[PDB]
Design a protein around this ligand. Structure first.
Ligand SMILES: NC(=O)C1=CN([C@@H]2O[C@H](COP(=O)(O)OP(=O)(O)OC[C@H]3O[C@@H](n4cnc5c(N)ncnc54)[C@H](OP(=O)(O)O)[C@@H]3O)[C@@H](O)[C@H]2O)C=CC1
Ligand SMILES: NC(=O)C1=CN([C@@H]2O[C@H](COP(=O)(O)OP(=O)(O)OC[C@H]3O[C@@H](n4cnc5c(N)ncnc54)[C@H](OP(=O)(O)O)[C@@H]3O)[C@@H](O)[C@H]2O)C=CC1
Ligand SMILES: O=CN(O)CCCP(=O)(O)O
Ligand SMILES: O=CN(O)CCCP(=O)(O)O
Ligand SMILES: [Mn+2]
Ligand SMILES: [Mn+2]
Lengths: 376, 378
């Protein structure tokens, strides 16, 4: 029975994870929860249902309202990870703020079931140096797919890793069409129900950019051998092409419970985690290229990744600041990626490899401040 | 450098295999060829291109025209296999006549790269009992796909095997429409260029039936956990569904050189064997149910397989006889599968495991006579 800490338990991934665990008592047990404090009703229900009071709440006043909270403050999640015996830490926090808990999870020796891609993108080589082989297991569906498909050959036989992208609500739209996009319109993802950040990032295509960096970091494949194809149904979750011309693909109706279940149970599958494809009804899986002129977020992510060092932290931190500005009505939708480009292209000093967490934090601070100057 | 014997070298698969070997002289060497004698100019070219004089030709007269052929007559292919040192025998013969070469190959201890699915369908447990694990490696694209996708879990984690079928030229047709099918129409496959028999069988859906039996025999998955789905593009070659709900699929533009190369090179992939999927232009992969009312060949294959023993030899033999009658204008297209069903339903005695090859041969003889009896009544 694996002991699981769930960071960001009240969120989209976190709540789906608690459901998988609730359905599988003989294999998993919750031993800790962390949240921000914005959803106390959810947190209350989760405390009662799991019987776990080992909980972190970032916001101090929220922690007082809910009562009986052992860790509060901006370091509460990190402290929780440091002070809880666990076999798996499921990091489902949102944003680069997942960085210290990610580093702490790796130091404990526990498996890190990583949903919080921003922590790996920001940490880069610093997070890789803190992990042992196989210690980080991806929850993100593309990387879960890739890990499964890589069982299909030897390392020297892999040609390309191919990520699928839904294309978002604005698939096929012109650059001009993006001008008057509202937060409401950006909020309507075609295939997944998610928190507001991954929703916005999937609309701007920054999510797929983050995922290209995540792919390079997790699997050690060169950027030039990572492809991205737009697949509107989000049924094929990604695929691997081998040197003989064969492709192996992983597929299922979009439901994050499946990759969540596998990250927890790895390498053993979890019976009944999610519905399989049903071929008793006619259907079709479509594929099309991404228009890189309209959506250059992925090319920008490749540029950031190839530069390496703290540049991937810069890419993500510029996004976090610019996205927030869009959500607040201070900038238009195209300015999100426009600001990322501007910040990235001014960031040559950050191509250096981080020695400690503080180097990544510095790079992020620099990027946010510059993005903020672009906004105003 | 693997020494390969290529049976059925002048055919669709055989010619494609020779090209893969030609393109990869560091990996493979042809050391034997077998053919029927119908394509002599092809065989002349192959002898010259490979430098191999170690050749079997089934038709004696044909063998004379080629000249200098060491093995000739109906057992020529089998004798070639028994007397040629090799690492891999690629059996790309067509029909149940591939049975004795398949058994002889297994006995040599060499890998059997099996394109000739009929020999396994006919031999059933007899062929399985002749083989060691990994010794039979499928050239058939569906089974090559399944083999690859099965690397994606442990055996108890497998829920279903899902085979794709092109649907053939008559996909979507009614039973009434099928009555009017000509041999010429049934010779036009949507996705693969093949010899006449697999082309016909893919149009009648008997090919998918044979492949369902082949799946059960190769992988040990029960018939009721083998699905078939119609996929008109033939890009996804087959898929495995696991107990968590995950499906793993193998895909490529249809090109038999890919599964041929893998079967020869197993478990090592052959660089550059075939083109990969390209996503630079918009495309669609479609799936739809098979119309089992109009096309019961797969259901009848399951029935035969479930019955077991010699019943799968009966299924295939009834098809070979009925198929040839349709080609000769002796019956209409729907009567192919109609005769298969009639023969199967009278075949209760053949649901016993074959002890020897002769048991299989007896069941096949019985089945052909029964099919001919049905044919002569039409
Ligand atoms: N949702 C999805 O399907 C997918 C998500 N991902 C990735 O998984 C991660 C989680 O995303 P998602 O579940 O959508 O996010 P949500 O916004 O739904 O959830 C965020 C979680 O983090 C908590 N949180 C927010 N700020 C803080 C803080 N300062 N300290 C501690 N906890 C905090 C929230 O708690 P509260 O709200 O209670 O304050 C909530 O539990 C993201 O990295 C995302 O990119 C990846 C692929 C798919
Ligand atoms: N073609 C394809 O893409 C696929 C084929 N297969 C299977 O592979 C096998 C071969 O199919 P395919 O290549 O299309 O068939 P073809 O009809 O194209 O080739 C048949 C081959 O067998 C030879 N042959 C015929 N009779 C005899 C005999 N009595 N003794 C020795 N050789 C003989 C023929 O020689 P000749 O013509 O010179 O007399 C020819 O070389 C079949 O079992 C088929 O179902 C499976 C999947 C795909
Ligand atoms: O793994 C699942 N997701 O990343 C949800 C977002 C999918 P998209 O970025 O392709 O729209
Ligand atoms: O493996 C390849 N084939 O069997 C070619 C026939 C394809 P079909 O039976 O699905 O039409
Ligand atoms: Mn993802
Ligand atoms: Mn086939």
């Amino acid at each position: 029975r694996l002991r699981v800490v769930v960071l960001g338990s009240t969120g989209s991934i976190g709540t789906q994870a608690l459901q998988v665990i609730a359905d599988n008592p003989d294999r998993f047990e919750v031993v800790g929860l962390a949240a921000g404090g914005a959803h106390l009703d959810t947190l209350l229900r989760q405390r009662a249902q799991t019987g776990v009071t080992n909980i972190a709440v970032a916001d101090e006043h929220a922690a007082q309202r809910v009562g009986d909270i052992p860790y509060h403050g901006s370091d509460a999640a990190t402290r929780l990870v440091e002070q809880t015996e666990a076999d798996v830490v499921l990091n489902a926090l949102v944003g680069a703020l997942g960085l210290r808990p990610t580093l702490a999870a790796l130091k404990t020796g526990a498996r890190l079931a990583l949903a919080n891609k921003e922590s790996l993108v920001a940490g880069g080589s610093l997070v890789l140096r803190a992990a042992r082989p196989g210690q980080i297991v991806p929850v993100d569906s593309e990387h879960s797919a890739l890990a499964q498909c890589l069982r299909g050959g030897t390392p020297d036989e892999v040609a390309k890793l191919v990520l699928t992208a839904s294309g978002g609500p604005f698939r096929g739209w012109s650059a001009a069409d993006l001008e008057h996009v509202t937060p409401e319109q950006a909020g309507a993802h075609p295939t997944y129900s998610m928190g507001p950040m991954n929703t916005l990032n999937s609309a701007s295509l920054v999510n797929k950019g983050l995922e290209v960096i995540e792919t390079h970091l997790l699997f050690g494949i060169p950027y030039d051998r990572i492809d991205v194809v737009v697949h509107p149904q989000s049924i094929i979750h990604s695929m691997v092409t081998f040197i003989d011309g064969s492709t192996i693909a992983q597929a299922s109706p979009p439901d994050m419970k499946l990759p969540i279940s596998l990250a927890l149970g790895w390498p053993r599958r979890v019976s009944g985690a999610a519905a399989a494809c049903d071929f008793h009804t006619a259907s079709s899986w479509e594929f099309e290229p991404l228009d890189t002129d309209v959506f250059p977020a992925v090319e920008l992510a490749r540029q950031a990744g190839v530069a390496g060092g703290c540049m991937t932290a810069v890419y993500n931190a510029a996004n976090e600041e610019a996205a927030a500005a869009f959500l607040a009505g201070r900038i238009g939708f195209p300015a999100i990626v426009g600001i990322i480009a501007d910040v990235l292209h001014a960031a040559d000093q950050w191509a250096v490899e981080p020695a400690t967490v503080d180097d990544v934090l510095d790079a992020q601070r620099w990027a946010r401040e510059r993005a903020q100057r672009a906004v105003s």
